[model samples]
Structure formats: structure tokens, C-alpha cells
Target: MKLHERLRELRSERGLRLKDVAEVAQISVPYLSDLERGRTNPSLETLQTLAGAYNITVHDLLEGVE
Candidate 1:
């Protein structure tokens, strides 16, 4: 699946709200929303923070990407 799809799926699978994940990742909710919608490309640091919040590796989060 695509990055946006995977992100949304993981968040939903974990029963998390956008605000919840944003708080955990220390990022703005709108920015996370944009990321999930494919409106923005996250930086490496941002990706690491998100991966940390999800308790997954960056590699796992980025797996299957082109």
C-alpha cells in the first residue's frame, strides 16, 4: 500500500486520533493531517518521530515505498 494509506491504516488500527498521534509525535495536527493526505512530504526527523510514536522502525514505516 501507499505511504498515506499505510499511515492512516496504522493509526486506525491502533485506535488513535489524529490529535493523539500528533501530541505523541510533538507535531501539529494539521501537519500530520497534511502528511496523511499526501499534501506534504515529511522530513527524516519527522518520520523518525512518527515512527517512534507508532513504536515502529523508520524502515517499517517506509517499507514498500518506491
Candidate 2:
């Protein structure tokens, strides 16, 4: 699956709203929305912050099927 799809699935599985994650990640909702829609590419720091908010490692967040 695509990155955005995987992210969306994880967010939904955690019962988190877009705004909730944005607040915890210290990112704008629109930016997070873009990331989730695959319309924007987040920087490494941004990804790290987001993963931290989700209580996951950067590797886990970025992992994809082989």
C-alpha cells in the first residue's frame, strides 16, 4: 500500500482525528492533511516529531512491505 494509505490506516486504528495528531505533533493540520493525502513530503525532523506523537519509531512509521 501507499504511504498515505498506511498512515491513514494507522491513525484510524488508533482512533485519532487529524486535528488531534496535528496538535500532538506540533504541526499544522493542513500540513498533516497533505502528508496523509500524499500531496506533501515531510522532512526528517517532521517525520520524527510525528512518529513521536504516535508513540512509534521513525523506522516503524516509514516501514513498507518488501
Number of the top TM-score candidate:
1
Report the lDDT of model 2 for residue 26: 83
Backbone clashes for every candidate come to 0, 0
Model 1 worst lDDT run, 10 consecutive residues: 1-10
Candidate 1 yields a Cα-based lDDT of 0.88
Stretches of model 2 off by over 4 angstroms after superposition:
none
Candidate 1 on 1-66: residue-level lDDT in tens?
778877777788889999999999999999999888888888899889999999999998887676
Candidate 2, clashing residue pairs?
Answer: none
CA deviation > 4 Å runs, candidate 1: none
Report model 1's TM-score to 2 decimal places: 0.88
